[PDB]
Design an enzyme around this catalytic site. Structure first.
Site, PDB file in Angstrom:
ATOM      1  N   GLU A  90      -9.580   4.535   6.464  1.00 56.86           N
ATOM      2  CA  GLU A  90      -8.716   4.913   7.621  1.00 56.86           C
ATOM      3  C   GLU A  90      -9.462   5.657   8.734  1.00 56.86           C
ATOM      4  O   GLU A  90      -9.324   5.279   9.947  1.00 56.86           O
ATOM      5  CB  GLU A  90      -7.484   5.718   7.211  1.00 56.86           C
ATOM      6  CG  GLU A  90      -6.573   4.968   6.299  1.00 56.86           C
ATOM      7  CD  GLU A  90      -6.024   3.660   6.877  1.00 56.86           C
ATOM      8  OE1 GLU A  90      -6.089   3.413   8.114  1.00 56.86           O
ATOM      9  OE2 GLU A  90      -5.514   2.838   6.067  1.00 56.86           O
ATOM     10  N   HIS A  98      -6.556  -2.022  15.056  1.00 60.33           N
ATOM     11  CA  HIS A  98      -6.710  -1.267  13.826  1.00 60.33           C
ATOM     12  C   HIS A  98      -6.567  -2.238  12.621  1.00 60.33           C
ATOM     13  O   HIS A  98      -7.484  -2.255  11.677  1.00 60.33           O
ATOM     14  CB  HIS A  98      -5.685  -0.177  13.772  1.00 60.33           C
ATOM     15  CG  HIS A  98      -5.770   0.690  12.584  1.00 60.33           C
ATOM     16  ND1 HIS A  98      -6.215   2.004  12.638  1.00 60.33           N
ATOM     17  CD2 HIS A  98      -5.281   0.522  11.338  1.00 60.33           C
ATOM     18  CE1 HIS A  98      -6.111   2.539  11.449  1.00 60.33           C
ATOM     19  NE2 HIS A  98      -5.573   1.662  10.636  1.00 60.33           N
ATOM     20  N   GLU A  99      -5.518  -3.038  12.599  1.00 64.07           N
ATOM     21  CA  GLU A  99      -5.335  -3.829  11.359  1.00 64.07           C
ATOM     22  C   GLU A  99      -6.400  -4.934  11.252  1.00 64.07           C
ATOM     23  O   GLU A  99      -6.848  -5.240  10.148  1.00 64.07           O
ATOM     24  CB  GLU A  99      -3.928  -4.479  11.271  1.00 64.07           C
ATOM     25  CG  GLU A  99      -2.801  -3.463  11.452  1.00 64.07           C
ATOM     26  CD  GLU A  99      -2.785  -2.333  10.450  1.00 64.07           C
ATOM     27  OE1 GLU A  99      -3.490  -2.360   9.341  1.00 64.07           O
ATOM     28  OE2 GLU A  99      -2.104  -1.327  10.756  1.00 64.07           O
ATOM     29  N   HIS A 140      -9.674  -3.409   9.876  1.00 65.42           N
ATOM     30  CA  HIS A 140      -9.615  -3.239   8.442  1.00 65.42           C
ATOM     31  C   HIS A 140     -10.139  -4.446   7.623  1.00 65.42           C
ATOM     32  O   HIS A 140     -10.553  -4.253   6.440  1.00 65.42           O
ATOM     33  CB  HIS A 140      -8.247  -2.996   7.930  1.00 65.42           C
ATOM     34  CG  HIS A 140      -7.796  -1.567   7.954  1.00 65.42           C
ATOM     35  ND1 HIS A 140      -8.434  -0.568   7.278  1.00 65.42           N
ATOM     36  CD2 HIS A 140      -6.652  -1.048   8.398  1.00 65.42           C
ATOM     37  CE1 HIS A 140      -7.714   0.535   7.334  1.00 65.42           C
ATOM     38  NE2 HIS A 140      -6.627   0.264   8.062  1.00 65.42           N
ATOM     39  N   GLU A 168      -2.622  -4.085   6.764  1.00 60.72           N
ATOM     40  CA  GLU A 168      -3.747  -4.983   6.924  1.00 60.72           C
ATOM     41  C   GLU A 168      -3.835  -6.037   5.828  1.00 60.72           C
ATOM     42  O   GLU A 168      -4.978  -6.335   5.414  1.00 60.72           O
ATOM     43  CB  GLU A 168      -5.077  -4.189   6.970  1.00 60.72           C
ATOM     44  CG  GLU A 168      -5.480  -3.411   5.676  1.00 60.72           C
ATOM     45  CD  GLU A 168      -5.028  -1.944   5.565  1.00 60.72           C
ATOM     46  OE1 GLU A 168      -4.019  -1.561   6.191  1.00 60.72           O
ATOM     47  OE2 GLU A 168      -5.683  -1.193   4.800  1.00 60.72           O
ATOM     48  N   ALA A 174       1.890  -0.637  10.793  1.00 62.83           N
ATOM     49  CA  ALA A 174       1.519  -1.943  10.382  1.00 62.83           C
ATOM     50  C   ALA A 174       0.629  -1.809   9.166  1.00 62.83           C
ATOM     51  O   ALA A 174       0.402  -0.716   8.709  1.00 62.83           O
ATOM     52  CB  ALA A 174       0.695  -2.618  11.479  1.00 62.83           C
ATOM     53  N   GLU A 194       0.844  -1.234   0.000  1.00 65.33           N
ATOM     54  CA  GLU A 194       0.000   0.000   0.000  1.00 65.33           C
ATOM     55  C   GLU A 194       0.859   1.256   0.000  1.00 65.33           C
ATOM     56  O   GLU A 194       1.922   1.223   0.769  1.00 65.33           O
ATOM     57  CB  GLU A 194      -0.865   0.104   1.243  1.00 65.33           C
ATOM     58  CG  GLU A 194      -1.995   1.094   1.090  1.00 65.33           C
ATOM     59  CD  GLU A 194      -2.904   1.207   2.315  1.00 65.33           C
ATOM     60  OE1 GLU A 194      -2.994   0.255   3.107  1.00 65.33           O
ATOM     61  OE2 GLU A 194      -3.657   2.187   2.382  1.00 65.33           O
TER      62      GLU A 194
HETATM   63  C1  BB2 Z   1      -2.300   4.909  14.417  1.00 70.50           C
HETATM   64  C2  BB2 Z   1      -3.071   3.997  13.477  1.00 70.50           C
HETATM   65  C3  BB2 Z   1      -2.543   2.575  13.422  1.00 70.50           C
HETATM   66  C4  BB2 Z   1      -1.068   2.537  13.004  1.00 70.50           C
HETATM   67  C5  BB2 Z   1      -0.952   2.092  11.562  1.00 70.50           C
HETATM   68  C6  BB2 Z   1      -1.196   3.177  10.498  1.00 70.50           C
HETATM   69  C7  BB2 Z   1      -1.069   2.543   9.131  1.00 70.50           C
HETATM   70  C8  BB2 Z   1      -2.375   2.008   8.735  1.00 70.50           C
HETATM   71  O1  BB2 Z   1      -3.288   2.755   8.451  1.00 70.50           O
HETATM   72  N1  BB2 Z   1      -2.442   0.621   8.716  1.00 70.50           N
HETATM   73  O2  BB2 Z   1      -3.672   0.089   8.322  1.00 70.50           O
HETATM   74  C9  BB2 Z   1      -0.022   4.109  10.668  1.00 70.50           C
HETATM   75  O3  BB2 Z   1       1.132   3.758  10.655  1.00 70.50           O
HETATM   76  N2  BB2 Z   1      -0.287   5.393  10.948  1.00 70.50           N
HETATM   77  C10 BB2 Z   1       0.697   6.409  11.204  1.00 70.50           C
HETATM   78  C11 BB2 Z   1       1.712   5.797  12.172  1.00 70.50           C
HETATM   79  O4  BB2 Z   1       1.328   5.249  13.205  1.00 70.50           O
HETATM   80  N3  BB2 Z   1       3.047   6.099  11.961  1.00 70.50           N
HETATM   81  C12 BB2 Z   1       3.738   6.390  10.673  1.00 70.50           C
HETATM   82  C13 BB2 Z   1       5.234   6.296  11.041  1.00 70.50           C
HETATM   83  C14 BB2 Z   1       5.345   5.344  12.198  1.00 70.50           C
HETATM   84  C15 BB2 Z   1       4.047   5.509  12.946  1.00 70.50           C
HETATM   85  C16 BB2 Z   1       4.293   6.365  14.170  1.00 70.50           C
HETATM   86  O5  BB2 Z   1       5.391   6.244  14.812  1.00 70.50           O
HETATM   87  C17 BB2 Z   1       0.018   7.567  11.910  1.00 70.50           C
HETATM   88  C18 BB2 Z   1       1.053   8.660  12.251  1.00 70.50           C
HETATM   89  C19 BB2 Z   1      -0.996   8.111  10.881  1.00 70.50           C
HETATM   90 ZN    ZN Z   2      -5.186   1.686   8.577  1.00 71.91          ZN
END
Ligand code: BB2
Ligand code: ZN
Ligand code: MG
Length: 891
Positions: free
Chosen positions: A325, A302-303, A306, A269, A267, A125
């Site tokens: 999302e 969260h995952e 999804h 999904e 992560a 993705e």
């Molecule tokens: C918080 C929601 C669950 C975490 C996973 C999501 C990714 C996602 O939508 N997976 O389906 C993500 O990484 N989101 C970003 C995230 O958590 N980040 C991106 C970089 C690493 C991490 C924060 O340290 C946020 C900032 C939008």
């Molecule tokens: Zn997500």
């Protein structure tokens, strides 16, 4: 700024891909990917060239229906698109075949297929599948997948792809193969593969309604298999929650979750094969700080969520991102609120939104939750689309209530299952439920769509009148959204305002909580049989994503803080008291600086507010997590929303003054509570049990660590003894706090050495240690960063390492923003360095420049100069270029 995709331009493909049959043969210095697409012509086809996405592929062969096609004559490939000229594209069902070579061993951007330590893993993705093989790589191209993976057996004993494992076989030369069939139509972005020497924990889960048996495996590298236990418990919790609240059951015989060391985000999904940043799947109580537990619960959930909101119902196009999302974040929030049973869980979300998301929404990057255009889709995985998305999805539950919300949600899932969907699909579903609730088929949620299309944060303001003799109270409400680049004329939104009315003489509720529905620019809500003049409790639970202008006195806000029922209104009342004080003292320090005064006055902190803090703190029945919020000032990124041309040094002086005024009154209280909380906070019940966490006990530790920070900065007498002792706790939350708070003492570097030795043999703990050092309030922090660079980080390309060294430091108001610009230069250099191998992480590291046009005019210049220098680097990525162009007002 290359090609710009626009939302109204959406058209279905001229082509159909019905099946995908992959062979992925992994070797040390190459991976060969053979792919058959069983394809057809769509009803939208007008005899166009057949164009596949394919990025950095080395072509071995290309054919249609077993006829080899040739470069120049039948196809062109430019390293980004493969064009099959129309005269050679069939006009009915046909088989397209390709074989390509890729090199996951040298893929440090962690998109497509790559190597993370000794694991081979994909991340597709949004646009990564095209880095693996040729595809029409867009989410509405839905197909069924049959995937074979081969590899050296000794190096890669475990082979995983989406869905049912249908065969396992041996291959000559010490190789082996596994074939997978995923029966569910999907877009390519949900394709995944993993190969590695993985270890696992497993369980069987039986679904609630149909009694489907599901095998659950969580996987990591061998060194960390014992850190998998919490994740597996969280998965079982997630599954139960979707069944219980939403009536949704899992839909394959097996679900695998896998941790990998090198991952750009939290992560992913991928159907049946969710892949995680190890930091969001792995923990142990001896080797992780507390926050890992809630992190893992959040990300596993969260995952998992999804599976329906993203996988069984997917996206027509990427403009619809918030539909999966925002909705998944809202589902996870409900889950996490139910699992944790702490009021601080909602407050933590609200704190994030009003800091980080509001900043975005008043920056040059402002966008609606459903954007109108993009260049790199990776830049639109934003706090806007996630966080403000989730608050938009949450308002539906607030408006409709639990029963009609669950009805509307069911209509959405039922109507769109197995298909793509749009944000309007969701709104239409909720609209059906709304009509049922109002018993009126003329009621509509057309106006509600503006939450999707209109950017910027609404401001909601209030005026009150009370008629003592008529026993009558009125709340007059106004909403305003500031015009911006997306809309020169903003329209009023459907804003739900959850309210209560507190009697200030006794602290009691005077009405049944009710939700006011504001749909005009202004409206007056009137209440009868209001026996005394109330104090209003506004936006309970933070009922809409807005700037709240309560128009309350500090006296009124104090009464709410002490006696209201709603945690958010209590916290917000406190936040507003702090903000009035900050703005006042900021203005006083600023006038002093600019006019070079030899003397001046500062407004003191409200003494009754202080007393109220004390009363709350000393209440043994008050919640420890809530207390930690009350003794902390609002975040810098919240404050900055209220100040133009912010002088960060003046703010730093403002915050230090206020904290010292409070501490000069309350430090003995802080110290008594730090000591009295110790027994319950650090009690070792469940320390060996990774299936259970006490989140209240965790909030006691947070409170103790907050108080210790406050006492350390104040140099409270002999607190150094308490810090030393704290460094011997078996809880890493405590012993890493000890390092942090030791910054104000000569012992810091002893505790740096001690905690480093405790952290260094666990990769995730070492990363928490790096964060701790980076965030330390040290005068010599630039020299300490150099030491980290030289001794620990070195040449690492692991995003968790890079992020851990730099990001916390960028939140050091006084040092990051040193007026020399040296902080800006330092982070820009890291961004530039990082962009050469991982553009997504580079753009992440630009986070602190998002507020550049909010600063004082010298800092504005110094940031802009650094951004302009980064934009001048040769071979800057499209990710980073797009981002900086938009941020700097060129795009
Ligand atoms: C918080 C929601 C669950 C975490 C996973 C999501 C990714 C996602 O939508 N997976 O389906 C993500 O990484 N989101 C970003 C995230 O958590 N980040 C991106 C970089 C690493 C991490 C924060 O340290 C946020 C900032 C939008
Ligand atoms: Zn997500
Ligand atoms: Mg490493």
């Amino acid at each position: 700024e290359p090609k710009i995709h626009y939302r109204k331009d959406y058209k279905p493909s001229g082509f159909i891909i019905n099946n995908v049959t992959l062979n992925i043969n992994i070797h040390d210095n190459e991976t060969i990917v053979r792919s058959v697409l069983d394809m057809d012509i769509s009803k939208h086809n007008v005899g166009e060239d057949l164009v596949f996405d394919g990025v950095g592929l080395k072509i071995n062969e290309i054919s249609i229906n077993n006829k080899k096609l040739v470069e120049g004559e039948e196809y062109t490939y430019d390293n980004e698109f493969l064009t099959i000229f129309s005269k050679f594209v069939p006009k009915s069902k046909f088989a397209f075949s390709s074989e390509v070579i890729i090199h996951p061993e040298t893929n440090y951007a962690l998109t497509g297929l790559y190597k993370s330590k000794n694991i081979i893993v994909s991340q597709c993705e949004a646009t990564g599948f095209r880095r693996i093989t040729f595809f029409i790589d867009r989410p509405d191209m839905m197909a069924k997948y049959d995937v074979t993976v081969t590899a050296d057996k000794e190096k890669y004993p475990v082979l995983l792809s989406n869905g049912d494992k249908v065969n396992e076989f041996e291959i000559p030369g010490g190789r082996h193969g596994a074939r997978f069939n995923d029966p569910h139509l999907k877009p390519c972005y949900l394709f995944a593969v993993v190969a590695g020497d993985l270890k696992h924990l497993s369980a069987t889960y039986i679904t609630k309604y149909t009694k489907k048996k599901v095998e659950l495996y969580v996987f990591s590298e061998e060194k960390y298999v014992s850190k998998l236990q919490w994740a597996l418990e969280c998965l079982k919790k997630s599954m139960a929650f979707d069944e219980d609240y939403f009536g949704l059951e899992y839909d394959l015989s097996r679900l695998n979750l896998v941790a990998v060391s090198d991952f750009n985000v939290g992560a992913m999904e991928n159907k049946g094969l969710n892949i995680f940043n190890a930091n969001s799947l792995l923990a142990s109580k001896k080797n992780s700080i507390d926050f890992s537990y809630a992190r893992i619960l959040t990300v596993v959930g969260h995952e998992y969520f999804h599976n329906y909101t993203g996988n069984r119902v997917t996206l027509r196009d990427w403009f619809q991102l918030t539909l999966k999302e925002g909705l998944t974040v809202h589902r996870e929030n409900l889950f996490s609120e139910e699992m944790t049973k702490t009021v601080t869980t909602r407050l933590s979300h609200v704190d994030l939104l009003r800091s980080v998301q509001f900043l975005e929404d008043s920056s040059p990057l402002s966008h609606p939750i459903r954007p109108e255009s993009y260049v790199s889709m990776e830049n639109f995985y934003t706090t806007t689309v996630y966080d403000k998305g989730s608050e938009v999805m949450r308002m539906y539950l607030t408006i409709l209530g639990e029963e009609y919300y669950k009805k509307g949600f069911d209509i959405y899932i039922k109507k769109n299952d197995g298909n793509t969907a749009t944000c309007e699909d969701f709104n239409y579903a909720m609209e059906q439920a709304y009509k049922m609730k109002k018993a009126d088929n003329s009621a509509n949620l057309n106006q509600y769509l503006l939450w999707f299309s209109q950017s910027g944060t609404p401001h909601v303001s209030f005026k009150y009148n009370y008629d003592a003799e008529k026993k009558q109270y009125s709340i007059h409400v106004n909403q305003y959204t500031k015009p911006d680049e997306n809309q020169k004329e903003k329209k009023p939104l459907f804003i739900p305002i959850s309210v209560g009315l507190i009697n200030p003489e006794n602290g009691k509720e005077m009405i049944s909580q009710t939700t006011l529905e504001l749909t005009k620019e202004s409206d007056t809500f009137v209440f009868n049989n209001i026996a005394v003049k109330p104090i209003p409790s506004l936006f309970r639970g933070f009922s809409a994503p807005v700037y709240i202008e309560d128009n309350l006195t500090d006296e009124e806000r104090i009464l709410l803080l002490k006696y209201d029922s709603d945690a958010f209104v209590r916290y917000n009342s406190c936040t507003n008291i702090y903000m009035k004080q900050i703005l006042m003292n900021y203005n006083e320090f600023l006038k002093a600086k600019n006019e070079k005064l030899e003397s001046f006055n500062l407004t003191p902190v409200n003494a009754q507010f202080i007393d109220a803090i004390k009363y709350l703190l000393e209440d043994p029945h008050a919640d420890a997590g809530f207390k930690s919020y009350i003794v902390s000032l609002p975040q810098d990124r919240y404050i900055i929303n209220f100040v133009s041309n912010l002088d960060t040094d003046v703010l730093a002086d403002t915050k230090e003054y206020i904290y010292k005024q409070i501490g000069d009154k309350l430090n003995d209280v802080y110290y008594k509570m730090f000591k009295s909380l110790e027994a319950k906070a650090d009690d070792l019940t469940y320390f060996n049990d990774e299936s259970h966490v006490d989140f209240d006990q965790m909030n006691m530790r947070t409170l103790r660590n907050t108080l210790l920070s406050l006492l350390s900065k104040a140099q409270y007498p002999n607190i150094l003894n308490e810090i030393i002792e704290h460094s011997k706790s078996p809880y890493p939350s405590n012993w890493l706090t000890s390092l942090s708070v030791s910054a104000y003492f000569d012992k810091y570097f002893e505790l740096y050495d001690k905690t480093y030795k405790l952290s260094k043999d666990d990769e995730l703990l070492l990363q928490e240690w790096l964060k701790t050092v980076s965030r330390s309030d040290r005068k010599d922090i630039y020299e300490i960063l150099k030491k980290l660079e030289n001794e620990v980080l070195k040449d690492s390309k692991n995003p968790n390492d890079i992020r851990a060294v730099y990001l916390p430091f960028t939140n050091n108001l006084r040092r990051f923003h040193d007026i020399s610009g040296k902080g800006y230069k330092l982070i820009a250099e890291v961004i530039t360095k990082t962009d050469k191998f991982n553009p997504m992480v580079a753009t992440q590291l630009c986070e602190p420049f998002k507020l550049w046009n909010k600063l004082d005019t010298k800092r504005q210049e110094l940031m802009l100069n650094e951004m302009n220098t980064m934009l001048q680097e040769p071979n800057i990525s499209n990710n980073l270029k797009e981002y900086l162009l938009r941020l700097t007002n060129k795009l």
